[PDB]
Amino acid sequence: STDSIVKASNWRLVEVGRVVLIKKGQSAGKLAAIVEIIDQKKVLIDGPKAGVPRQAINLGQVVLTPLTFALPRGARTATVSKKWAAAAVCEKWAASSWAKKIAQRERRAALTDFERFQVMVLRKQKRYTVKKALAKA
Amino acid sequence: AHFKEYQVIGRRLPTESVPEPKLFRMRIFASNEVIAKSRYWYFLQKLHKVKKASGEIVSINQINEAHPTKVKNFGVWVRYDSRSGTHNMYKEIRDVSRVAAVETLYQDMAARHRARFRSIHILKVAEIEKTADVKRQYVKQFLTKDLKFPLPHRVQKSTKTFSYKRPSTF
Amino acid sequence: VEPVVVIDGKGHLVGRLASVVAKQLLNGQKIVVVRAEELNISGEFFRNKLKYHDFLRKATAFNKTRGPFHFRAPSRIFYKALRGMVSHKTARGKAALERLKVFEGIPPPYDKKKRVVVPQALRVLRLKPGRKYTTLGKLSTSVGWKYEDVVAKLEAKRKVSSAEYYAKKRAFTKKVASANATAAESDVAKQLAALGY
Amino acid sequence: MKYIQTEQQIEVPEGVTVSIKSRIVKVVGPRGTLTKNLKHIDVTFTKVNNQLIKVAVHNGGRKHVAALRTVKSLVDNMITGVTKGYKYKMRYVYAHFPINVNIVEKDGAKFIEVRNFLGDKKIRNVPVRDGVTIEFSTNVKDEIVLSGNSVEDVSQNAADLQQICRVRNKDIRKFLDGIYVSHKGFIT
Amino acid sequence: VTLAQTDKKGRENKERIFDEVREALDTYRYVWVLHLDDVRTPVLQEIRTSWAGSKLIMGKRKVLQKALGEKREEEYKENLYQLSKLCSGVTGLLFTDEDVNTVKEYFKSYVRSDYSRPLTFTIPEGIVYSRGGQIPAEEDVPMIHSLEPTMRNKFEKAGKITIDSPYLVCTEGEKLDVRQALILKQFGIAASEFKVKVSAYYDNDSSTVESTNIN
RNA sequence: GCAGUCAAGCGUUCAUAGCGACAUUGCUUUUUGAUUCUUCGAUGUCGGCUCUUCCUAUCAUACCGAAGCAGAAUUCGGUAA
RNA sequence: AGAACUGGCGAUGCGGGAUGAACCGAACGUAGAGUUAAGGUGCCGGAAUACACGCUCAUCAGACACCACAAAAGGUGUUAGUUCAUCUAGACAGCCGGACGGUGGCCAUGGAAGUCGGAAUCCGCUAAGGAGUGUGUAACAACUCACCGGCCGAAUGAACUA
């Protein structure tokens, strides 16, 4: 116990190969990988598997996602597409909780009124078993 | 606006006893076609003795970027008019295409040196092919290997007027 | 969206809060603002003192009673900055300021209810880091509010009572989440997951 | 010109340990413990391995980077105070009136008392701060010695002790009375 | 800002000493490199006038390293690069052609006395003086009062300067402080002997590297 | 102010075109504290009693700075109505 | 105070400049829907607390033509520039060592020995060191710089432009 407990303050930091999510624009919710950083506020992105074209973007329009993978700086679209498959980030993305939350509110919007009735009848059944399990232990 | 780089070609006048005037081309940064024809006579009258009524324009062409998705260092020579007499300036921009780099230059001149569009003359925009001959400092710091920088203290723009979460940064 | 909305006053800016409050009062929403003594003003402390003093000397020369009443309390300072935004001379402005209640601290019954914040008026989202601000609770003490030794004492009494509630609430949520976890994997749970709940 | 990142390096010797939650800095070692607040200064601390700690400022201008160097200068002064300590030795030149300096405790407050300064009947008190010990130099005439762990606890009490004896309404070139700081040094 | 007469030399002076080393090699057949860290200026001159046939060149290190040729392959004359690596201290190269014995006899026989930068002296507990107890104090002249604020600050009554406690400025068997060097330096005590040393000799026509050590 | 000596700056590419700051040097009734009682003519109406306020460009009191200030007595400057 | 060409006010409302005979848009029957001018979009107050690159902190900041404010000249406050030199054969800063013989040079003199002063003002040896940058002793001495050298390892200094 003669150790320096100094905190790390972990951060998502931009680099080559930091995969990102485009929140607004033409793409609107697609994955893409940063190819080369231009300056403080602009980068150069590309995702071939998702469908976003290669373009330069401001960092205001994009959000940082914690997944990374190894990729050389200044790569072309064929080379990013090959590295994309080797990391298999499209499988690693759906494992994360933040991708599941996106899909859930997408599904709750597409619910039919009859399906919105079926959500109701099940939650009336689920709360009956819980309140018996509660208030005994 | 979105600048578009244009080539304009000028041929003074075919007259008797002087056939075939030579020809004169320029590269013009202008937001559309009609300004670039008028921006052409603004320079070409300064160089030698012609007029628009003593002139006609041969052909216009839109010069696209040769390689958009490649990242280029650009060194731009600029002459401009101040409140005092005119004087030169050399500046360096790192950007995506030629015609997007002039966009960031006029914003840079209007911010720091308070120069509108009419005062600035664009001398030569050149791509610096090799690295490590970049003169300026603020362009040079992005050329270090394995450059990684965090973005601390991000704000969040929320549409509802009231939020209940006591909102938090990064 | 709610009948009476309780805005927590901590960490906000005077002007940018009072703008978005004044629009809701003119639209019919009832707003009650609590913890006024924690409100913040941009700029350093010595500036905002002198912006008060050149205001403080402006009063009617032939009779000082009839002039601009220089209120001192942090709620009253904030109520001033809001009152200039609503057109308070008409009948529309009088009925718009009767929807507003501003308090120092949190008095009962507003401690039992939820408090909210306004994201376009937070200090920590608006100003750039490395920039001087000013606490309004210190400011009114420098110009004659003889109650900061009282309001801060009642908060230290409140927060101990509030910390006992939260520990009771957190242990009850622990029992529910454990009961909800063992309720999962049932046939009613798996059909909900398909529909998204 | 918006420097992208700048860093300094604070060296930690073998005696001391430092534990830092958000900006509160604690230095624990041989002679004692010292703490310092840093909520206003806006930096990021990072340990590499147990003897070197990097500070960092990302994307800051010239005024923000200028404050980064003095953070290194403050934490280095904390480490030396815990290892070597600080000792200020002061002398007091009197022209004609001998200065009586004593240490009196007033309900546990330990005030430094100055008498007979330049023929004044006024009895001045100088309070001793927390973490500074005042002792009189054995076998050296006319010396008062201040020693403590923190620089700011000692060096303020050194400067407070001299300004209370300031000469007024007189030509200072002829009247040379006062208390002065001889030199600034370490305990060991 | 200043208005002094003497100006900076520049790069051309560094290339002139680069020129002087090349011509001195083939003319004088012996080359002598020396470690002379602390030297006095009239001591440097009298070595030049005791060796009138010689040429002596002092200069910066990497200039003198490159003037011999710091690389193995690149050099003025052959087998020159091994001796250049050895000379770590401040050097002044020497060029005499008489003898390999007389030169190593000369530096071992030559010795002077300078500042310490050993023996111990105590300041007497009376009035201090310029010599400070070297000669009897009745013959002594008291110190100037103007350098007393230097003594209360840097060296750590009447105009005659008084100590009340006895002070020892040195102790034997001890490395002296840089400050304790200045205490003897101000009093005028040059009791420590000074001697210059040589590390390597070279012969041009023999063209081999000679390695030795004298202290 | 005029008569000069300069030249820190300017005159489309420029010394000597043309200006030309800070400076600098000279008289306009007496370089030796003698004099020298020289008050050389304002062409539309305000002054004072009482009694409040306000400006600071501060004469006095408050705390300071510099001095070419031993003390005393002063001189100069800052905050301050 | 008096003229010249054209427009306007007087004779003329309406939208914009908070307010305004003269400015900006536009000239009037009574009404409905549509799009705009000049001006504006935090709240009063109808309309983006829209987007994008920068700059600026004021112990009297600043905010939009006519218009209700200002001068020269200064400011290691900040930013971007020009021309010049130094530099990985080691710059800038820092400590550390050298800074000498002719000669205490000549008149000045109670006494400056480089430094109360006045004219004057070269060599020797040098990597380098002034017939001397300053602290000053009554005159000496000493210290320092201006000149190099050893450690030390990334660019730095100077004027000027706005």
Side-chain angles (χ1 to χ4, degrees), chain A residues 113-127:
Chain A
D113 184 75
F114 177 71
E115 293 181 354
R116 193 178 300 116
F117 183 75
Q118 286 187 356
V119 169
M120 175 181 171
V121 181
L122 293 177
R123 294 176 70 251
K124 297 293 285 294
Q125 294 181 358
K126 185 178 179 181
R127 77 172 69 186

Side-chain angles (χ1 to χ4, degrees), chain C residues 19-31:
Chain C
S19 176
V20 307
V21 173
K23 187 64 173 177
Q24 300 292 321
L25 296 175
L26 295 173
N27 296 329
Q29 187 64 44
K30 296 181 177 66
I31 288 178

